[PDB]
Structure formats: structure tokens, C-alpha cells
Design a protein around this ligand. Structure first.
Ligand SMILES: Nc1ncnc2c1ncn2[C@@H]1O[C@H](COP(=O)(O)OP(=O)(O)O)[C@@H](O)[C@H]1O
Ligand SMILES: Nc1ncnc2c1ncn2[C@@H]1O[C@H](COP(=O)(O)OP(=O)(O)O)[C@@H](O)[C@H]1O
Ligand SMILES: Nc1ncnc2c1ncn2[C@@H]1O[C@H](COP(=O)(O)OP(=O)(O)O)[C@@H](O)[C@H]1O
Ligand SMILES: [Mg+2]
Ligand SMILES: [Mg+2]
Ligand SMILES: [Mg+2]
Lengths: 450, 445, 450, 91
């Protein structure tokens, strides 16, 4: 009957059956499950054992679907204790589609934690009635312990609140490591532009830089210049998620910058021996390193972006930089109707990413026309209208004003000034850069002052 | 075999030995309170006799009976015969302290089992609550007994039991110098007077358009309250990691600009301040920091409980750029998200007897006003925090929105809400390269 | 075999042991169980009589566990007669969690109905075949009364529908008891504001008052003044649920208001002898009385509010006032997905409480900030957006406006007006009061008409 | 072989194209897993009038265990309930 079954401890075996075989079908969602779920949150011995195997093996063994699991279990030699491969095959039979997993990873936690807490309550009571030579303070410190042990068994790392001295020693090691080598003016990533390295103090390793201007001001060119220089200097990856334009134009413009010959003398082939030599030079010095990876997709969400980036992270080493062109595309199905909160959540998640990996971010944007009808037309932070979320999240913003698009009579055609709208860890101001942009590159401007 | 453990002749013994010796009253009262006992009549006896020991000394048999008649309560305690049974029996000696002690012990136990059973109830019939919103309940209810010393975790409170704590509060400060302060000192001799210190149950909110160093101000607060006070503090930087936080606070102390530190070059003049503040900070270990990515309020509560379980009790908190906080279940709608956040914050602070400091942000419908001082109706996040809070401090600083304006190197603290006091406005300075506001010793505003 | 297991009347015995095992192990639940179960709902006579004692004691003698029960059970001569002490120990030995009771008392009621219906069906049929020379008129009224006796066995004796004449006797007795004594215009509770009792006839005793405003008008002060006054104007308790802020501030405020001194002379300590005199007076008047009870809780539900209140009601006297502060914090978690239904639930439940005890209920609120864009700002029934159920349940609503926040050039300084906006018994109006908040109290205003 | 007809949730409706797929079949995968062949169906005379597919029926196949997937065209003359083959432009 049910009355004899009512004393049962809550357990949801059905989803617990589904989840294992669902991950046997796919090892791509495995991290989001490993975080949210732990062994003891499985009810019985065998499922728990199988998840133990499937969790330890991905530290070393990539292939865990059906049979390398048998190789593992052989190296443990615990055949026919969970039924071995017999009941394992009975399990691997199940959920041959396994579309999604999240709720089936959450209800486990619900039932597991509830069961555990209630066992604890039972213990507290029946201990209070059978005290066994004990007194209140000792009677109750155990209660503190058994209550706070639960979530402590689920926390994973020292992610918790850092004592002061640890972060202190970390920062002091940074100061010392920097004190060894020359100052360089930089405390992070270099951009090449020495005049910019001062104000910015170098692109810092934990931030969400933003760059912005109307379309034909060529912000995209500047972003590619940044990643370009940062790739040639470092011994470390970079990444580029260009959305609007596919990659076979990206690389043409990249060679236009690196190689200082226009697109037209490349797509055609009118290039002289010196020009052939410089194209071959950029080719050969990129070939040795091969830092860049590119995803020239159509439209994306931050959730996919974290996966695509962390895959590169685990492939080799910590990354050095990221770029994102024309931010406004990156969707979110939840708020596909509204836009304000959409941009808010985008910026939020990208900040979270950049902190999750301790690496910078570039992330461009568009502006609103209305600065046209101000008659000075110089950008300010009020101009880009996205509810001003980015004006809060961002550790850095800067703008571009190429003089020649609006005015032509003026003599400063071909010069472009950067405006730094806001910076967290420094001052604001401006700089002056120059533009020989039939091959899409900026360079320094060693003129008189501004 | 099993029973909610009560002793019942110890109780009668205490009542009897308390009747004949009216003076034997503080030795008891320091150990026992009405709800500590088991039955109803003995409680009402105890509290009426307390009412009599207000002034009336003689309380054994007859004056008690007469008062208890005046409240019209005789014979609901048995009767006058059952009463005189007590003075008849138990002429015992002064083995009275340990009686009250064991009775208090039994009461603590009974309370413990009651809590455990409530936990089991809410484990079986959660009423849509998940586990996250359930461990919160459990840990709170247990912690309230474990930390607390008055061991009456839940219930209403009759008044005398409240006035005792109130007047102990009003007592302890007069002995020390009061100095206008109650709670925490910010170190700013003008703000202390408009505030009397960050009172230890209140949700403070800071609010400003970004480039104002509100982050800097809050760091300055927790810093000064880390050194003056001798209890922990917490700093949650959802805005940025701790390697920047450390440089900034250390800079604020040593009065050396950041651009010199991270550059890695500096003078003996500066080393003599760095080493010092390092050591003075290190021989306390006040601080704890968390450089997380995205937090719920429940995680905040959890971490805080574990801290105070370690040792003593915290005294200040700082949360950073509150809009990042997201309770995931209601991520689809934003207003209720903010409301639940602020609710949880308030209950946290009230639970631990602390202040809280929570930064925020503002809507840009103020810039077109052409005056640009903030006020209450400027922040549009449903106004869910305007109703929850106790203290607010907007910030304005003229040398952003103008270059030539003749208030250079000055900010100001526009207060817009005060739960226990009045409002005002204050003048402070800003030297943004070593990141510390200072007092404005000058004319008024 | 099992076939002969079908003619048995349905019953449960393990649940019947487990219930009593929990109740004997814990007294906190008797409300719920007695709100689901009655003596005859059990199977046999012993467990019936046991439940009889375990209710009839908690009527007056609260404690019922194992031996405080047996000490009464003996005096009716029933030891070693309903199972006895040795067997009765079994019930307290096993199931020492008291983990679930309510479920283990639902099914008993189910089977009890299912059995007391069938025992009636058979007893109707056999008489329908053994008519005894009866006639239908003498044969169907018994069946009526039989079927209805089932539901009568459960119903509490004093919740049914009353006749006109008894109610009318109560009414005339009320008017009589009034005319034995002056009237003062009051029909219940007094406040201290004679300007208010005329439009209100006092706080009536079975209602849901609401006191709504913008943040800084001072509603909290007003409610505290009300309960503060009704303390000394009565010989009967009160309650407060200061969900907003804890006791050590509330009592400072209350004390101060009673003694006409500012808070800033207490917590500072720069005060006079006249001061301490007026302090000790109100102190020694509060403590010779023992009316008030306070609850510095954090977050609550009506389900717990009812329990905390009824504990007070059953301990001593019947309460005569309540206050609840900053209502919005009251969680009822099942609905927290939504808010409109949440407020509807709370209002519904508080109304039901107040009427279940025949007492008033102050309860505060907040107003949405829509009025600001109107330039009149005198609040009205339309600007509170909390499902508008509070606009329906309430037998009274009294907003608060106070010009010297919005304007500062005021011809209307130190004056707070009370915009009543709804009434269920009297008429509407508007009251004019004065404010001097450095000690947080409102006062009368002997002044011009309006 | 065994034919076994079935029905579809209206969950497909709001998609603005309303051609079925496998995931449109909300049946806890109870036959998306325990099947060998599927052939969803569509007929554009239903959802839209200005669709230039008057008298068209297409056999959408979200799955075939033993072979390749596809997408196929037929006609429809429901006035006596029969399908024919399509001899027109390709697909
Ligand atoms: N053949 C060319 N002649 C002149 N300018 C060029 C040529 N090719 C590229 N550019 C410059 O490169 C810039 C890149 O701009 P664009 O890619 O449109 O910016 P965004 O990516 O923001 O749209 C252009 O604004 C343009 O002035
Ligand atoms: N080293 C520095 N040199 C010059 N200005 C600085 C320096 N550090 C900070 N600032 C200024 O101080 C302000 C601090 O703002 P911040 O602390 O980020 O508060 P918020 O997070 O609200 O912007 C910035 O506007 C910045 O311009
Ligand atoms: N100690 C004080 N001195 C001067 N004014 C005060 C003091 N305490 C409170 N006030 C004023 O009186 C008001 C009290 O109302 P309050 O309790 O804040 O109502 P609410 O809970 O609705 O905010 C405050 O808003 C404040 O303006
Ligand atoms: Mg572009
Ligand atoms: Mg900040
Ligand atoms: Mg209030």
C-alpha cells in the first residue's frame, strides 16, 4: 500500500536513470552537470559509482560513452558489483535521444538534500532523547556541525571567501615578478601604441573594454589592429568572434594591416617582390605560432560563447584576449522580445565570463545618430543609447572621431582622435592617431602636442 | 523511554524555596525566565511574583494570593490549597542555583527538539520551496540558538525581557565616552553627526552615476571600520577581482598613487608607509573577501553564517554593484528579482545585528534636467529598495559634468532618506589617484 | 487467504500508532490533528479514549506526553485497561522522529468516512428487507438523520449557522451594556485623537485596517502611537510584528514618544532631570501592566502568524489589538513566482484571522510611485497596485499626506493630514493632524474647520 | 511492418513556419526512441491562403533509421481522398 510507502525517503530514480545514459550519449554538457550534481546526491550505490567513474575519467580520459568505461572499471576490477557491464548495458540502452538535462540535474538535488536534512532531524531528536552523558554546549555544537556539513560537502573549491593574506601574497608576488623585469609601462597586455599604453596602463587582465563609433569610422579595423599586435607580441592565444562578415575578408584586411598593401593589390595579385616578401613574412611568422581561432557564425548567445571559449582554454593554456564585433546581434531567447534588459544581460554575462577566466575582452558597439544634430558631433557617453547598462559594467570605454568624414575642407583629413569616455583604474583624456587606411591600419602620431 | 524531558519536583522546589526567602530572587532570576518552565500555572505564578518583586518584598502565601485575586486568576492554578501545598512542603536549603540550571538545560533541549521537528515538517511539505530557500531556513533557525545566549530563538517577547536589553544598551555607552556615536565610526566627524554611525541593523544603500568612486567610498568605510573596530568585515566584489581591490585599499592607506605601485617603482618615503600599513593590517586579520562572478542572496547569507560561526560575529558588509545579483528562478522578470534581493538583505542584517552596505546605480533621465543633483525619484528599479532601506547616500561631484566649475576636488553626500533621523547634505573631497575621501574642514554649504 | 480479506472493513493501524507516537513525543501539532480527526475516527475504544485525553487536557492542561497523561488517566481508573503502561510505552519508543503526522492523520479520516458510510448502507438495506411493518414516512427520516450524523460527528459544536433570535439577544445585550455607562462616541477601541473617533467610531473589533503612504510620511509612527495609546487605555493585550526593524529601536521610539523627548538625547546622553523623571514614569507604568508583546522576526507567513497569536489567546485573555508593519515582506512562498496573487492570499488570510478572533488588525503598506507625475499628489484609491485586493477586503483605509516633504515653501508646515479613502460602516472624510517628529509622535489639531 | 498514426501538440504553432520536426513530438521521447521510421506531414492550404501551394502535400521525414532523411512532395484532392505523385519543378 501507500501508507507503508509513505515513510519512504524522497527519491526520483526515473530522471536519475535518464541522466547517466543521457551523458553517455554526449560528453559536451558534462561540465554543467558535474557542477550542479555530486555523488551522494544519487540515491543508491551503483548510480553513484557510475557517476564517480564518469567524473574522475574526464580529468584524464576523454572517451567515456560505453566501453572505455569498461576499460576503467577493469582497471578497478569492480566488474559484476554494480552488475558490471551487464546492468551498465541495461542502462546504456535507455534514453537513446536525451535532448536536455537541466531539470533532471536539479530535481536530484532537491530530493537528495531534503532526504539528508530529514535524516539529520531524526538524529537530532533521537539523540536529544538518548543524550548518553552529554551537556548542552556539546549537545549543540554537533548540531551546528551536522547542519553546516551538508552544503560544505557540495562546495567544490576555495572559491569561497578569501582570507586577506592569500590575495595579499598573490598581489605581492605580482609586484615582485614585475620588479624583476623592466617596467615596460604596462601591467598586462600591450597594444603597441606607446601613447595609449600610458593612460590605459595596458589592457588589464579582467575587464570588458568597449569601442564605439558610427559605421564608417572603422572601429572594426582598430579592433583587428589590437588583436593583431597582441597576438604577435604574446606567447599565448587570441580569439576573434566576427559575426557580420565571414573570415575570408577578415584575413584579407588582417594582411592589409600587417603587410601594408591594400586589398586590391592582394585579391588581384599585382604585388611586387618586396610585397610578395612581406606577405610571405607575415605568413611565416604567423605559421610558427598559430594563436588565432575564429568562429565566423551568424548569431550567438553567451551560453554558447562560454563553451566555445573554455574549450580553447582546456586545449592549451590561458588565453590572452578576445574580440566581439557588433555586439548588438548576440541574442538571448528568454528576452528575445525586449531589448534593454537583453543588452543588460549580455554585458552582465560577458563580464562574468571575463572574470571566470581572468582575461580581457573587447566588445564593440554602434551609436545613435543624434550626435549628428548637435553640430559639434564629438562622441560622449550619452550618445550610445542602450539604457546605459554598458556605461556601468564596463571597466573601460573609448570612442573614435575621424575628422574627414564630416568635414573635408579642414586640413586634418586623415587623422583620427581617440576619446576615452571612462576608465575604472585610471584617468580619462584623449590621444591622436593617424590613418592610412586603404590597407586598414592605424599607427602612432609623433606630432606636436594636443 | 522517550519523553520531552521535564523535571517537575525541581520546579516546585524552586517555587517553595523562593517563597520563604524573598531575597533569594536575583540568584534565581539570572538563571530562569517564565517560558523556561513547562506547565502554565507555574509560569503565571513566576511572572506575577516578578511583578511583586518590582516593589513588594513579602511574597510567600498571602500577599501573592491577594494580588492574584486582584487579577482574578485563583483556582485556575489548582487552588489556594494546591498553592499552600508548596509552602507546606519543600523547606529545603540553598541547593537552588543548580536546580534552576538543570531546568534551563531541559528547556534548551526541548527547544532543540521543537526546532528539529519544524525542520522535518518543512522538509516534507516545502510548499514549492526548493532546497536553496530551505537550508537558509534551517541554518538560520539553528544558528539563532547556537550563537545567541538568551536561547529563545522564536516567539514574541514580553516587554520586561525587551527592556532589559534596551537599558543594557543605554547603560554600556555612558561608561565609555559616547562621542555622538552608536555602532560604527566612519572616521568622518561630520557624517557621524548626521548619522550617529552605521546603526547595527540597517540596510544602507549607496547610489551614483558611475564615475564617482562610490566604490571608493564604501571601501573607505569598511577600511576605517576594520581598523577602529576589532571585528571582521566582508567585501563582495562582483564588479572586479580582488587583486585590484587590494592595491586600491592599500593605496588609500599608504597615500601613494596606484600608477606608481603597479609600475613597480617607488621611494623610501613610500616603503616606510607600505610596510607599516601592511603590518598594522596583518596583525588583525579582520577582512574577508570574495571575488565571485554571479551570486544569489542565499550564497551571501550562507558564507556570512559560516564566517560568524568561525569566531565572534561580523560587524560590517559591502556588496558591490548590486544589479549583478540574480536569483535564478525569477530571472525572466526583473522587479521581483530586485525586491527579493533587498528583502533577503534586510533579514540578513537584522538576523546578525549588523549594518549592510549595498551599492546601486541610477537612470539617465536625470541628465536632461540640466541641474543634475540626484533625488529620491531618480532611481528606477521599481523603487523596491526605496521602501526597504534605512539609509541612503546619493553622491554628486561637480568636476565631472563641468571642468571649470568652482567646486574642484569636492564631492557631496546628498542624503535622501533617514529612517531614524533627519536628512542633510555634506561636503567631502576627492583625490582620485590614491582613492580616499577626506573631511572638508571649511565653510558650510 | 485474501478473498476473506475483502469483507473486512477498511482500517489502518500503523498510522494509528505513528500519530500517537508523534503527539506523545511532541505537543506542538495538536492544532492540525484536532483540525482533521475526532475520537470515533479511530477504529477501537482504547486509542479513542487516548485521543480523548490528549485533547481534553490540552483544552486546559497543556502538557501531554507519557506520564503527565497517565497521572490523569489513572484518576479515571483506566491504567492497564486501554493497553496499559507497558504497551503504551511502545508508542513512544518507535517512530521517534515525529517526522510526518498530518499525512498519517489524513488517511485515517478517509478510511473512517469510507467505513461509516458502508456500515450505514448495510444497516439501511437489511431494514429495507426487514420492514417490521413500518411505513416509508417512519423509514426515510431515520436514513436522513443517519447519513447526516456522519458529518455531524466532525463538526465543531460552535461554528454552525445561528438563528436570528440569539444574534438579536447579543445585539440588545450590547446596547444595554453600553447604556449602563457613558458612550464617548466610541464603540470599541479608543486612540487619543478625538478628531478621528467621529468619522470612525473607534477601531471596530472585527476588521482589517490599512495605513498606506509613501516612504517617509510616517505611517509606522502612527501605528505605534495607536497601539501605544490602546495599551494604557485598556486592561488587555496587544501584539506587534516589527518585520521592519528590531526591538531595540522600537522601544526607544515608543518610550521617547510617551515621554516627549527626542531620541537623540537618549542614545547621546545629554539630558535633564525632568527628562529622567518622565522616563521612569512611563517605564513603571508599562511594567506594572504587562500588556504588550513584540516579535522582531525576519520573514513570516499567515500560517505562523495564526499560531503565534492563538498561543497568546489560549495562554491568557483575549487580545484586543494587533499591528503588522511593512506588509510587503510577508512571504508566502508557493506564489513567489507572482505577486498579485500573493497579496490577495495575505489579505484574505489576515481578514480570516481577525474574524476568527474578533479583533482589529492594523496593517501597513506602500504606494506605487505613479502619483508623482500629477502635481496634486493627494493619494487616492487608484494608486496602490498590490492586486487591489487590499482595496476590497479592508473595512478601512487611511492614507497619509504631509506637504513639508514635497514642497518646502509651505504654508502648511508641521501638519499631516489623513486622507481616508474607504469605509465599510461609517462615512469618509479628512482629518488634520500635526507632526513633530524629533520624538516621533502625532498630535491633535484644535484649529479651523476644513 | 506496423503503421501507427498519432497527433501533435499545437506547440509547433507559434514557430511562424509550422513545418514539423522530431523535437516537436512531445511524448517524453516514448516513440522518438522506440520507433524506426517517422513521416510528419504538412499541407499549406491550412495555415495560409496566399501560399502558392494550392493542392500540395509534402511528406516531411524527420528520421529514418536504416537510411537517409529527406523531404518529399505530393498532391492532394480531398474531394475523394487520394494522393498522387508530383510531376512539376524539383525540390
Ligand atoms: N579602399 C578603401 N578606400 C578608402 N577607405 C577604406 C578602403 N577600404 C577600407 N577603408 C576604410 O576602412 C574603414 C573600415 O570601416 P568599417 O569596416 O565600415 O567600420 P565598421 O566595421 O564599424 O562598419 C572604412 O571606414 C574605410 O574608410
Ligand atoms: N589612479 C587613478 N588616477 C586617476 N583617476 C582615478 C584613478 N583611479 C580611479 N580614478 C577615478 O576615480 C573614479 C572611481 O570610480 P569607481 O571607483 O569605479 O566607482 P564606480 O565603480 O561607481 O565607477 C573613476 O571615475 C576614475 O576616473
Ligand atoms: N530622530 C528623528 N529626528 C528628526 N526626524 C525624524 C527622526 N526620526 C524620524 N524622523 C522623521 O520622521 C519619519 C518617521 O517615519 P518613518 O518611521 O520613517 O515611517 P516609514 O516607516 O513609513 O518610513 C522619518 O521619515 C523622518 O523624516
Ligand atoms: Mg564591422
Ligand atoms: Mg565600482
Ligand atoms: Mg516603517
Amino acid at each position: 500500500p501507500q501508507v507503508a510507502g509513505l515513510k519512504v525517503p524522497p527519491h526520483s530514480i526515473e530522471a536519475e536513470q535518464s541522466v547517466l545514459g543521457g551523458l553517455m550519449l554526449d560528453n559536451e554538457r558534462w561540465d554543467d552537470v558535474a557542477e550542479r550534481v555530486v555523488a551522494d546526491d544519487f540515491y543508491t550505490r551503483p548510480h553513484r559509482h557510475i557517476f564517480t567513474e564518469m567524473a574522475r575519467l574526464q580529468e584524464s580520459g576523454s572517451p567515456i560513452d560505453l566501453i572505455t568505461l569498461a576499460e576503467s572499471l577493469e582497471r578497478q576490477g569492480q566488474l559484476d558489483s554494480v552488475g558490471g557491464f551487464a546492468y551498465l548495458a541495461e542502462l546504456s540502452k535507455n534514453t537513446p535521444s536525451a535532448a536536455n538535462i537541466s531539470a533532471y540535474a536539479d530535481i536530484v538535488r532537491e530530493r537528495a538534500v531534503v532526504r539528508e536534512m530529514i535524516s539529520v532531524a531524526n538524529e537530532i531528536a533521537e539523540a536529544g532523547f538518548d543524550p548518553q552523558g552529554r551537556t548542552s554546549e556539546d549537545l549543540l555544537d554537533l548540531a551546528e556541525s551536522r547542519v553546516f556539513k551538508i552544503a560544505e560537502s557540495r562546495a567544490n573549491k576555495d572559491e569561497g571567501p578569501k582570507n586577506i593574506a592569500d590575495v595579499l601574497d598573490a598581489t605581492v608576488a605580482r609586484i615582485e615578478q614585475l620588479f624583476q623585469q623592466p617596467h615596460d609601462g604596462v601591467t598586462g597586455v600591450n597594444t603597441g601604441y606607446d601613447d595609449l599604453n600610458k593612460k590605459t596602463a595596458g589592457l588589464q587582465p579582467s575587464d570588458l573594454i568597449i569601442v564605439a563609433a558610427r559605421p564608417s569610422m572603422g572601429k572594426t579595423t582598430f579592433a583587428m589592429n589590437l588583436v593583431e599586435n597582441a597576438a604577435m607580441l604574446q606567447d599565448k592565444p587570441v580569439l576573434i568572434f566576427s559575426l557580420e562578415m565571414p573570415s575570408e575578408q577578415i584575413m584579407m584586411r588582417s594582411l592589409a594591416s600587417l603587410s601594408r598593401v591594400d586589398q586590391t593589390k592582394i585579391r588581384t595579385g599585382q604585388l611586387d617582390d618586396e610585397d610578395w616578401a612581406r606577405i610571405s613574412g607575415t605568413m611565416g611568422i604567423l605559421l610558427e605560432k598559430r594563436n588565432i581561432y575564429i568562429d565566423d557564425s551568424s548569431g550567438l548567445t553567451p551560453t554558447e560563447v562560454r563553451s566555445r571559449a573554455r574549450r580553447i582554454a582546456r586545449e592549451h593554456g590561458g588565453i590572452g584576449l578576445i574580440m566581439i564585433d557588433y555586439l548588438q546581434l548576440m541574442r538571448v531567447p528568454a528576452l528575445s522580445d525586449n531589448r534593454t534588459l537583453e543588452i543588460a544581460e549580455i554585458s552582465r554575462s560577458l563580464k562574468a565570463l571575463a572574470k571566470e577566466l581572468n582575461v580581457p575582452v573587447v566588445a564593440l558597439s554602434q551609436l545613435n545618430r543624434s550626435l549628428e544634430q548637435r553640430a559639434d558631433k564629438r562622441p560622449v557617453n550619452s550618445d550610445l543609447r542602450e539604457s546605459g547598462s554598458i556605461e556601468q559594467d564596463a571597466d573601460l570605454i573609448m570612442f573614435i572621431y575621424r575628422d574627414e568624414v564630416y568635414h573635408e575642407n579642414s586640413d586634418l583629413k586623415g587623422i583620427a582622435e581617440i576619446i576615452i569616455g571612462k576608465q575604472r583604474n585610471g584617468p580619462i583624456g584623449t590621444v591622436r592617431l593617424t590613418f592610412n587606411g586603404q590597407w586598414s591600419r592605424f599607427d602612432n602620431y609623433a606630432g606636436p602636442q594636443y
